[PDB]
Design a binder for this molecule. Structure first.
Ligand SMILES: N[C@@H](CCC(=O)N[C@@H](CS)C(=O)NCC(=O)O)C(=O)O
Ligand SMILES: N[C@@H](CCC(=O)N[C@@H](CS)C(=O)NCC(=O)O)C(=O)O
Lengths: 226, 226
């Protein structure tokens, strides 16, 4: 049966999972949490090991913990390298883009003033720390992909991160020619091109409606700081 | 050559790595960051992909990102299950204890008042969310170990987490009989017993000296909130 993604109708921590499944050409279904009662019913069913989402029903498992879910999908669909060392490189690269996109998780919950500050913080991290690191990886081996000269989860996570940064600062990739070429190549891969196309399950930049729903369902995150 | 752990002379994010290596019976060396100049020299050498530590020199790699390092060690020393699904369970369990211990990372940098609040926050999470979840895993299959009826990284991460919670609230495991038995069994495993014994490389609860050193080296974390 198709994987079922339990989360809010928005990006959050589930977006990277949507990306990986789409990139692997895997059709999935989604169950959106829209009300407090719906969440309480979930808690009572005990299907959320730690009372939290993301949660993905896949291959008989009720998998929680974002990274555990991604690790599983990457491995199942051969996007995790060919051995222990390649997986280590993929994990190291993913850790970097996970931190980068992680700095944007609170963004929609921030005040107008903090959004400006956070945006500057994220762009600075991208241009001074992360983009230089990945540009160097590509420059050092000169291959089209980050690891093993073939598409991996690391490439998919980086493309998503690059797009999120560009949504905040359109010219953020300026000065990183290899990443620019990388962006075009990965975006053209059939499964990925389809995901970036209209009508896909890719979610938009989070808005006030998303925040309102998260707060209504979880009764939390009422005062987020940068 | 033996793995080399680059970090501060204290727990932080490197402690779990020390635990896993010790549990696997692997002898390692440590390089402690004590001065700003030492850190600047590291940055200039480019050995830290994202300008941060933990960093572990192992099998020819300059591995950064805590989870990437742990994933590698767990896999290399057969403490990651026997297949994709067992790894998924291990990752899900580890995610929970990583979050739990993660809530304690800022603790030594907190004010006296915030430490009291944070301690209450952590204990509540342990008794209402995490301990119940792991107690249930053990209860459901009745085996001595969390996954595959053999020692895994998940068991090691949970034991460490249990001990950290008990350091904050000694009777926190009360009401969780299976976890109590689990604590005694895992603590008795030769490699682990040795790590818990005097003279090991296990690090103590972080103190003001640790905080002072982190702030001196990184010139950051000057005002941490709960
Ligand atoms: N470490 C978990 C964290 C999950 C998490 O923080 N989930 C939030 C929603 S984005 C949640 O369920 N919050 C409710 C709560 O913690 O009580 C992961 O990576 O999946
Ligand atoms: N996601 C990274 C985070 C590493 C991290 O936050 N490292 C801190 C020390 S505990 C650091 O190097 N901070 C300096 C900085 O970020 O500039 C990991 O899990 O290893």
């Amino acid at each position: 049966a198709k994987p079922v993604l339990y989360y809010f109708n928005g990006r959050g921590k589930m977006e990277s999972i949507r990306w990986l499944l789409a990139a692997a050409g895997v059709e999935f279904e989604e169950v959106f949490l829209e009300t407090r009662e719906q969440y309480e019913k979930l808690l009572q069913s005990g299907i959320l090991m730690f009372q939290q989402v993301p949660m993905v029903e896949i291959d008989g498992m009720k998998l929680v913990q974002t990274r555990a879910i991604l690790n599983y999908i990457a491995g199942k669909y051969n996007l995790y390298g060919k051995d222990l060392k390649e997986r280590a490189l993929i994990d190291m690269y993913v850790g970097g883009t996970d931190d980068l996109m992680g700095f944007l998780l609170s963004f929609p919950f921030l005040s107008a003033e903090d959004k400006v500050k956070q945006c500057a913080f994220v762009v600075e991290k991208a241009t001074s720390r992360y983009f230089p690191a990945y540009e160097k990886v590509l420059k050092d081996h000169g291959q089209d992909f980050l690891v093993g000269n073939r598409l991996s989860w690391a490439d998919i996570h980086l493309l998503e991160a690059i797009l999120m940064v560009e949504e905040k600062k359109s010219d953020a990739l300026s000065g990183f020619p290899l990443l620019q070429a990388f962006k075009k190549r990965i975006s053209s891969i059939p499964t990925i091109k389809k995901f970036l196309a209209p009508g896909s399950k890719r979610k938009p930049i989070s808005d006030d409606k998303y925040v309102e729903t998260v707060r209504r369902v979880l009764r939390m995150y009422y005062d987020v700081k940068p």
